[PDB]
Ligand SMILES: CC(=O)N[C@H]1[C@H]([C@H](O)[C@H](O)CO)O[C@@](O[C@H]2[C@@H](O)[C@@H](CO)O[C@@H](O[C@H]3[C@H](O)[C@@H](O)[C@H](SCC(=N)NCCCC[C@H](NC(C)=O)C(N)=O)O[C@@H]3CO)[C@@H]2O)(C(=O)O)C[C@@H]1O
Ligand SMILES: [Zn+2]
Ligand SMILES: [Zn+2]
């Protein structure tokens with residue numbers, strides 16, 4: 475049926491640069507193409523309908539063009555507030571269909587993370603589990619490595635991590651990694667450390683605490 | 688123009704879901720209302736529409752299990768879907784073109800999870816500020832929201848009065864099958880004993896509401 479193909483999946487631009495988003499239809503959809511913006515924890519918002527009509531209240535830097543099978547959304551001078559996923563859709567014929575989305579991120583100067591560590595709360599330890607959290611705050615670019623060490627033993631398989639979407643106010647990422655042990659295992663060791671590798675750091679940085687301090 | 692949806696929740700595979708969309712600011716006898724869904728980290732999928740005149744059109748891939756109806760006098764539109772599959776897990780939206788050529792107005796979304804697991808409210812633990820969460824004049828503190836199901840949870844700080852510097856991280860699915868997430872905030876390190884910081888957690892599927900004060904430890 476009508477497949478919509480967006481390209482690229484992701485792109486990275488500096489502030490002030492012109493951004494071009496592409497959407498291709500597998501059949502002629504004439505001008506029945508819309509573009510949507512979606513930010514984290516928000517519903518989609520209409521930007522462009524009828525291929526080229528700017529919707530109410532949308533800034534003039536957003537422009538749509540194209541017809542038949544080739545459609546374009548341009549942002550003439552991209553701003554921090556434009557970090558979002560962008561979706562195209564056709565409403566030419568049933569069933570209406572959408573592309574898979576394009577994620578827009580911004581380039582900025584390298585920024586090293588601040589690294590913080592949190593021992594488990596006493597209330598959690600009463601219940602029989604220990605979560606240890608390492609926080610990497612406000613870094614760029616997104617690539618980072620977190621290595622847990624327990625009494626100098628490199629850990630594998632007992633941690634999970636999550637990264638925020640890029641922040642509109644300063645274009646950085648943050649990352650949280652959680653190391654989970656039983657209370658019984660947690661009580662056996664003294665030193666808990668997370669070691670962070672990032673291109674903004676001359677050498678990997680370690681943050682640690684000692685369970686007996 | 689406004690579209691308000693019923694709340695998120697868990698439903699069992701092979702069974703049926705119901706979502707209500709209550710509209711205001713326009714009349715259902717003049718505008719059609721559509722349903723669209725978005726599987727968690729993916730694109731949008733159109734499900735169907737009930738037009739102002741009351742006829743319906745459905746996505747042919749789903750039409751055997753999909754039903755859309757409405758009550759004009761109550762400004763309500765209903766989505767019903769049965770023989771649910773695990774891959775029906777999605778954020779479900781009501782939307783309308785209004786007077787435009789695309790989906791100009793959207794509901795707030797209803798997160799529906801298809802699973803045989805249990806609904807479970809979270810435990811909330813402090814991430815206590817310390818010397819090891821300080822960098823000069825800036826300190827970080829937070830709260831760990833652990834062992835809940837299904838998504839989502841809402842986290843605010845000081846009931847929403849504190850928004851600057853907050854990072855709420857995407858949840859991870861633990862090996863137990865329950866979700867865990869953290870929320871952190873950075874503040875002046877000199878403020879740690881002088882200001883009250885409370886994380887507020889709302890897990891709507893369970894009606895769990897927890898306020899956790901986050902204080903420095905000794
Ligand atoms: C304020 C007002 O004027 N209200 C109208 C509303 C209102 O406009 C809509 O609800 C939008 O908010 O519309 C009302 O009328 C509806 C109703 O009449 C239904 C009945 O099914 O049709 C609606 O029109 C839709 C068409 O059914 C649908 O086919 C098209 S697809 C887009 C298109 N124009 N394609 C052109 C070619 C079609 C594909 C082609 N197929 C062929 C040639 O057979 C192919 N080759 O594949 O979309 C239409 C909507 O955009 C109609 O809007 C209502 O809701 O009842 C009337 C009310 O007065
Ligand atoms: Zn044409
Ligand atoms: Zn051990």
Ligand SMILES: [Zn+2]
Nearest residue numbers: 612641852854
């Ligand atoms: Zn930040």
